[PDB]
Amino acid sequence: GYTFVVRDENSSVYAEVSRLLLATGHWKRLRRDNPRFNLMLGERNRLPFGRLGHEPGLVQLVNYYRGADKLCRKASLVKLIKTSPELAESCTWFPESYVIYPTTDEREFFLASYNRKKEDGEGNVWIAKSSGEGILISSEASELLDFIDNQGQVHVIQKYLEHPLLLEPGHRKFDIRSWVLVDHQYNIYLYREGVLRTASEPYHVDNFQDKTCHLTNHCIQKEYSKNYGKYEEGNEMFFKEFNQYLTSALNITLESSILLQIKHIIRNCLLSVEPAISTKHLPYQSFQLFGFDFMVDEELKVWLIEVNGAPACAQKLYAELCQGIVDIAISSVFPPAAFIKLENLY
Amino acid sequence: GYTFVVRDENSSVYAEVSRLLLATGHWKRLRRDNPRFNLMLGERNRLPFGRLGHEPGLVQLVNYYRGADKLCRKASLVKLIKTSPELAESCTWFPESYVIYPTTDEREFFLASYNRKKEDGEGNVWIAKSLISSEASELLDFIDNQGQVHVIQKYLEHPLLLEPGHRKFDIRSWVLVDHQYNIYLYREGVLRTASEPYHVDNFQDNEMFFKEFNQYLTSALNITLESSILLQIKHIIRNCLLSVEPAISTKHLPYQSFQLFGFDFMVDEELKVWLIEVNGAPACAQKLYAELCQGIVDIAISSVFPPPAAFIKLENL
Amino acid sequence: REIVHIQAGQCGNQIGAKFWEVISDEHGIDPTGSYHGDSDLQLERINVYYNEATGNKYVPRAILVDLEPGTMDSVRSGPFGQIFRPDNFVFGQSGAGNNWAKGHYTEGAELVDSVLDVVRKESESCDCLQGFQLTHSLGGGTGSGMGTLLISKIREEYPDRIMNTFSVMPSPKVSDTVVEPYNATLSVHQLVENTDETYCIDNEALYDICFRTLKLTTPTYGDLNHLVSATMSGVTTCLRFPGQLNADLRKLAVNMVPFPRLHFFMPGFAPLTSRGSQYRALTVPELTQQMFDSKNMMAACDPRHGRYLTVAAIFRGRMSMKEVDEQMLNVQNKNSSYFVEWIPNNVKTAVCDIPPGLKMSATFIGNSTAIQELFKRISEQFTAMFRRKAFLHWYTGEGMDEMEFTEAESNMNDLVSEYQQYQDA
Amino acid sequence: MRECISIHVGQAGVQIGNACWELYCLEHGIQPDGQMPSDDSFNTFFSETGKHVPRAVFVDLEPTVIDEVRTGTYRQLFHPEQLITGKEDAANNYARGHYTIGKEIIDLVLDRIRKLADQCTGLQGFLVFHSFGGGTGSGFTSLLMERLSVDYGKKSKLEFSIYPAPQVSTAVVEPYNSILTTHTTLEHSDCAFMVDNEAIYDICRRNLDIERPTYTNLNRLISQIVSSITASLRFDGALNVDLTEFQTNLVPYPRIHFPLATYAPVISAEKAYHEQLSVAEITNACFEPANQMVKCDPRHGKYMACCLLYRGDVVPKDVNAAIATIKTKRSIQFVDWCPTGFKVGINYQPPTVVPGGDLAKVQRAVCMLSNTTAIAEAWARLDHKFDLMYAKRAFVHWYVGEGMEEGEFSEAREDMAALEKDYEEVGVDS
């Protein structure tokens, strides 16, 4: 006889999780703000972590890890990669990024790196993004910095991946989204199914104003791409179609060419923040579903772009992903092959 | 003025360094146990680090970093790779190794990994060092019939073979870490090559320089030494020395340290560099002694005691 | 059928004091020793643990021993401190410094005869003494060294009686000194020879329960003692209330101990309460699944890593006996591999109407071969130090010889190999 | 009821003793006249009359230094019989302190000590304060320790030994006196806390911004560390752990009885800034070489024991979290034969500072006692200086002239060589 609260109605993932908990006897949905719960499906911002686990009779579990924002925010992820001992010297899968503040700034270091590639004749395209809206792709540091100063928000100048892996037919850009569930005991689980947020326009290296070929954001493609849904429904390619394209056109499997790097990046990222977010020494337990965003270059190298704390699932994967959250993260604490447990070699 | 002591006559590198200091006219060599020195070219084992920097007014510098053997001894390097937070999850360049004690002790973990490889039909050749075999029962018995602690490393069955000859080789790089911890990779490396063709069954079995090796790479694979091997080497050196940096740094110590390291690498057929071992007291190649020893005098000694382009300073991004 | 209770050392007196507070409440005895209970089914077997004094007062048949007055002064001042017979407080002034040799050979030998005089006095006033129960830790010096010394002397004077102990095993997670593996190994050697039944209360298990299960991050000795006193209450229910199963120490030993040396029991309890916890009353199926779960064991051993030789389950409170039998039969049918097939009907079940406290609870007592994991942990720690003769000077300085350590280490290794032999049968 | 008698030998022992007792009085609310208005655990160190009198004995072979105690602010604190003086000092000569002049005053000292022992219902042992370098501190102390082992067989004997530092050294033969006293006292001391004057000197210059520290500066900082170590004996609580319980963990082998002490925080009274200093901050400072009482590198030495003694506003939760962070981030390597665990003790009584002192008053403080093989560096430095002079027999005639033989020199040096080897062996893996 377990009880749960829902403090985020906008979360599509946990709305399905709530329905899965109901219609299976064991769970009763308590009113919002009712503190006598077992599971809390909390809000995205300002979650009351301090009030959790202070009833010495019931076991409390929350769908978020306190402090995950030091990995899921654009500027804090850049800070983590460059300053964590586990990542600062070993990270070869994160594009060269610098935190910029408009009118802890790394503005001077960006200009030094921009001038170094310029003098050597190296690729100098950079992308600026706020912590799809307010994104500028340019090969001019003067143009990029001025863009930041206009908006009143912290931006991050990341090195633009000028040579991405282009899907054929169409010759189009894409990004990979992977769903990772970390349970109460910090066991990292990669959901078997991923999604490719593809572009429906052919990719070209010259015109950066054409956002339909340069930005693979789902909202950018539905609102501006004239060929939206031309190659695949809702510009979303799944791992079966992507593995078939890879094994055919490039003669290599998705598991070896891309998924091994993905699994390595996920484990390195979550374990760098593990000591700062572990609920071992806290009165309550935590679990979180993450959305890892990757970009593959033409040499088949995976690059981490962003990490999402509150991700949204693909329509067909909602049933399996939400059932996996119920079984692995909820039923492990409160008991009545689709998730790979990511582990170290030794 | 500047005075120095030589407590290792067997060191060929520092014998040449001693000659170079004496040639300047700025350096005078004192007796072995004279404690009023400026520079100490200490001994390989049991160096008296506790006595250093305590004589008042004297600036003392030693040719070794206290610790560093944690990166150089085979078992401690295996321990460091598997336990350091900076290396445990990120290390993809060190062959799968298990420290095996003969008389702590990862014997049960080695057998679990060996059984995983024979069940899946994967390559199961391992090398035990203080024997190359694919059996593990005769590998374990070899260790127990010796009073030493061995390490069972995964044998690289598909190495990059030099043509002509179809022969195995390993790369040795010289790294000088001065006081203030600046890592310098010596421009010239050496390839300790084999003069016999490679066999994948016979378990019973010469210095090429970087110009000849660079020329073999294009035309042979159309790729240069850099972007395929030299970037990997530089990354490995940076990661290794910085994992032990907080444990060996002399910034809060009364004396200063510097050390010349010998990094040993092995390149596989996919052009991937693998770290095999690090040497605390390495030996140089005959033609590179003059340039390497002059670099040690200029970068590490003359920076502390004051009277080009051959050492690349390794930095991140 | 009287039991003479003895508590020795800091731990022994702290857990012992709690045990008396707990059962005194259950039996309707107040701190003054007067009975004010709402049932007489509290006085039916009250004589098993209490003596009857002048003004209808019930006095615990307890002997409080320690080489330091500190802990015993704390007891005398606590809630039920006035319940004990003042003459039964036997204490020295120079403690034991967490040294087994001091408690067993030097400091303890000077105080032991006066303790035996009190034991003898309590025994002479027994219509039919069943035996003794000692509470103590094995990691300290008084409870560990002097406690096993007392056991040896008592056995000499009462060889035909049952010697039962509640022995708290040491753990690095809840440690007082680095010499605990020495003290524990030396005591286990004594226990293997001179006790009929020992309840292994592991501080490692009590810690992991408080930390991982109760989520009491930073647990205190008071937290560990909450679990202990609750388990001690459960395992002694069959001796304190009218019943048919394991109603005395000898029948318990006959049912639970198939091999003389294999008498170390793994207690279990459900529900796992936390001092001042919240609302529900656990259904019989829930009580059964928990008490058999590794997470409810008072010894840090995984029962799935061995087999049960014998098991004794006790349910307390008003519940369906039919449901208890169904649930007890189900746990065995669902895990029949973890119960030795060569001991038919090795799981016995008892039910007591009087609950602890709680509305209903379940206590588990298991003689599992997995208990070797506890002795292996200690043996590993002991060997790591003994190999290099670390800290031996504190022991050899008291008269002990290295040979004594080699024998204790060997006897405990034999105990482990014996438990393994029956696990492979 | 476990009393502790303190014995302060020679100038260093006396002057350090003055600082400790001044601090203990402030900590226990005891006035310079012995009166204690607040009026037990503090009775381990003080006897009662309503005058609270230290269970201490001050010994020096010369009267100037103790005469300052006899006429100073705390003159009333001590009983005249507790302050013992000779006429002629040991002239920085171990042989004069142990033999020539020591023989003349030893019996009187043992009698004054016996008078304190007779007032004890359960004497726990002695705390002996002395320098390694002085003739009395080295010579007389070892004679005293030898006699105490005879007259009090079992009883524990702890030391606070002032290790020589050139910045404040007064004699070229201090290395000789150090080896001689260490050798003679080794079997008779159960635990010894070395205080390197160079380490205390450098902390005063760095953390307190003192250009040229004086003995008063050094001694007040030393008294804080000594106070932290003895706090468990003078106070009691649920989280307070007794020093002898730490001593069981601190001394694995009889000869390896020299724990390294590290203290935090050491903040200037004017440059305090008002910062509070978390439990995590001070615990981390315990692993900074700049805060150790002896100059050595614990990063390159194996631990055999680690004890944390907290003093002010400290709760276990914070301590455990701080220890967890320190692990998997620091060069804390234990020997394979010792559990890699930290023994913690907390005294809720906050640290006290002397009014008008160089130290700022803090809300919380910690002293770490660790038995690390890194302390053997201190022996190596001393033994090397001994070797330099002894090779030429320099100054040896001063010792031989007082009845000593060259044999005692080599016997003491051989024992030190064995001690350095014992620290080497205990670090080797099994």
Ligand SMILES: Nc1nc2c(ncn2[C@@H]2O[C@H](COP(=O)(O)OP(=O)(O)OP(=O)(O)O)[C@@H](O)[C@H]2O)c(=O)[nH]1
């Ligand atoms: N920290 C500290 N060190 C001191 C003090 N007085 C002396 N020393 C040190 O102790 C050593 C000298 O020993 P002293 O205590 O002066 O000598 P003594 O025991 O009186 O012996 P004699 O004068 O030879 O009879 C040197 O290393 C001094 O730096 C003091 O008050 N504090």
Ligand SMILES: Nc1ncnc2c1ncn2[C@@H]1O[C@H](COP(=O)(O)OP(=O)(O)CP(=O)(O)O)[C@@H](O)[C@H]1O
């Ligand atoms: N360094 C880089 N190289 C190449 N393409 C990049 C890039 N950084 C971003 N992009 C492109 O821009 C898109 C949006 O990137 P960004 O990291 O801003 O997205 P997001 O999902 O975190 C949220 P937002 O809507 O705020 O942009 C990516 O999906 C990718 O197509």
Ligand SMILES: Nc1ncnc2c1ncn2[C@@H]1O[C@H](COP(=O)(O)OP(=O)(O)CP(=O)(O)O)[C@@H](O)[C@H]1O
């Ligand atoms: N895993 C491996 N794969 C291939 N060759 C290897 C190997 N390990 C060692 N070798 C070869 O065997 C030689 C043995 O050299 P040595 O005994 O000095 O130590 P090493 O560099 O092999 C140390 P480690 O134990 O770290 O592998 C190497 O120089 C190399 O040529």
Ligand SMILES: Nc1nc2c(ncn2[C@@H]2O[C@H](COP(=O)(O)OP(=O)(O)O)[C@@H](O)[C@H]2O)c(=O)[nH]1
């Ligand atoms: N559960 C429990 N363990 C204790 C308690 N006090 C001490 N211990 C444990 O007992 C051992 C120390 O023995 P102790 O009883 O303190 O000492 P003694 O006076 O020499 O018997 C260590 O293993 C401690 O962890 C207590 O009250 N409860």
Ligand SMILES: [Mg+2]
């Ligand atoms: Mg006890």
Ligand SMILES: [Mg+2]
């Ligand atoms: Mg005990």
Ligand SMILES: [Mg+2]
């Ligand atoms: Mg003097």
